[PDB]
């Protein structure tokens, strides 16, 4: 089946999207992201936002936990950071403590009593006291045996104008590059180009990272890939490069009803 | 100050975008439009989605009243339609009733005991069983006193494919036109040559509704107007169509911190 990822957390409710359990339970990913997690600029706690899934969201250990039993991996995304004028001391190293202590230490914190497998950062802009990149590194630097992954979601332009640094740390696992919504390195029907040359771009540049190609599942989103286009001229093309790693699915939302995941190869 | 809305609901928790309250407080607007509810093909009871702002979202009835009493419009958007591949029956008729039950009575519903003021449509896809131009037709058609506005999101190109039946049906009284993120008829530095022919469509082909110019408050998303461009600029060239509006802010978040609205003309 290879690497299929998949974001969840944003598509409404376990009603409309599915509980994070139903997700992993299908069989079709080996890693999820959780989106999203609100960060402060001026040092506030952060705020989880998994939309209309739940406010007190701690009832969701046991479904982590249940995919992390099923050699699934749950990384957390930044998805927002709300801005501040004022100048704030320590709010990266702050972040990292405030991260480190909630989410990957097993102790009481908002998603319950969990070690999350990692971080991804959203393509949005940083702070004037919170940066990214500064954040990558803390997190890797972290007080701790266990292994953290760290990863981002750029746009296919290359560079990234909000992620180009944390990718430069060279301390990023993967990087899940968005092919849709409208970019000049989107696949349009009948012409892959922009979208092979992307590839090879984030590819050669990157060489530290393993990269994936993320993707809609639904055809009512810009850079769609029918299955079969998918299959049989896309990955035969872009899997020539040492660090492609797989597909990252936009989003579990419509995967659910697309069954996208299901029609990619073997 | 004319006429300016906003859309509010989605830019995270009451510490990221503030409360509605704090947005009808702030004096910039004279609309709200809420986002959002998620509604079910199947017929399922729909899901309100007001992200982290609230689960229990019933203590809104009193910034809902508030902002009313300030004479300032609420209307709450339909931003998902979870499709379903069964042929259910009377699903369209069933939301009108269930909209005007819950949020249209001043009874005891998701916003607790409200009388909103109407109902915006995204372009998003609609149902197999649910139908955006019959769900605009049976609200318009509903058995009360009250005035129902009816308003949909286009973006700005022109037929919108989602929304273009319910603008034909002639019973939306506002269209909120996207003009950001990427498309052809979006602003570009020193080049609003696509706006301007987009807003003289819109406005020649729905004469029937009032159209707003939906721009984004913040330089980091596409189609954004510096205010200066905005006031010297395109309104004085957009507010020669008749039935030009107004100016619908995305969205209170960016708008919080960037003070857009502010900058606007008199
Ligand atoms: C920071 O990054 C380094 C390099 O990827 C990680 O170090 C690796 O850790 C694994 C498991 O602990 C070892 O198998 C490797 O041998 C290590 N590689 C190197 C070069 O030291 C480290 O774990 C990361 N930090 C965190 C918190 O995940
Ligand atoms: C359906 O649309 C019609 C037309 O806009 C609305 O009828 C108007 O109602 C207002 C206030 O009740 C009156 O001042 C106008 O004279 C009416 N116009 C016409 C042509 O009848 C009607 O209110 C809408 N229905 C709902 C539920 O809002
Ligand atoms: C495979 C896996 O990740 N298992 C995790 C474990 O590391 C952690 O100690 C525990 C308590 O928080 O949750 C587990 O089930
Ligand atoms: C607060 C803010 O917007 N910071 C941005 C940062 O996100 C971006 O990566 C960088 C590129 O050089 O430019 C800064 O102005
Ligand atoms: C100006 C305005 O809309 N006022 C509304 C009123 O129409 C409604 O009867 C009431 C109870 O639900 O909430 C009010 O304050
Ligand atoms: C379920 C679905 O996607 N329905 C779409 C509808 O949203 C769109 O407005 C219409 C345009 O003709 O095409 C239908 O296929
Ligand atoms: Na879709
Ligand atoms: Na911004």
């Keep these: ?25 299908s069989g079709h990913y080996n890693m999820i992201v959780l989106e999203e997690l609100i960060t402060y600029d001026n040092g506030r706690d952060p705020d989880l936002n998994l939309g209309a899934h739940c406010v007190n969201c701690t009832s969701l250990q046991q479904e982590i936990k249940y995919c992390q039993l099923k050699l699934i991996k749950i990384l957390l995304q930044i998805g927002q950071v709300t801005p501040t004028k004022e100048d704030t001391k320590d709010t990266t190293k702050d972040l990292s403590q405030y991260l480190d202590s909630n989410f990957f230490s ?36 972290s007080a701790t045996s266990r ?37 000049p390195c989107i696949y349009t029907q009948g012409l892959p180009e922009d ?49 492609f790693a797989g597909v990252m699915i936009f989003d579990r939302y419509f995967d659910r009803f697309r069954k996208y995941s299901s029609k990619i190869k073997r």
Aim: proline share 7%; aromatic share 12%.
């Design 106 to 141: 097993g102790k009481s914190g908002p998603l319950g009593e969990v070690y999350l497998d990692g971080i991804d950062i959203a393509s949005v802009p940083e702070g004037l006291n919170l940066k990214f990149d500064e954040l990558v590194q803390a997190l890797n630097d």
């Design 1 to 25: 089946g290879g690497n299929i990822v998949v974001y969840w957390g944003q598509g409404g409710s376990d009603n409309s999207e599915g509980s994070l359990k139903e997700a992993c339970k």
């Design 195 to 243: 979208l092979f040359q992307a590839m090879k771009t984030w590819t050669s540049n990157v060489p530290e990272s393993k990269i994936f190609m993320a993707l809609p599942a639904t055809p009512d989103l810009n850079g769609y890939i029918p299955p079969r286009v998918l299959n049989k001229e896309i990955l035969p093309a872009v899997t020539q490069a040492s660090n």
């Design 147 to 183: 292994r953290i992954y760290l990863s981002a979601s750029p746009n296919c332009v290359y560079p990234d104008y909000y992620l180009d640094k944390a990718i430069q740390t060279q301390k990023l696992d993967f990087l899940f590059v968005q092919f849709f919504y409208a970019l």
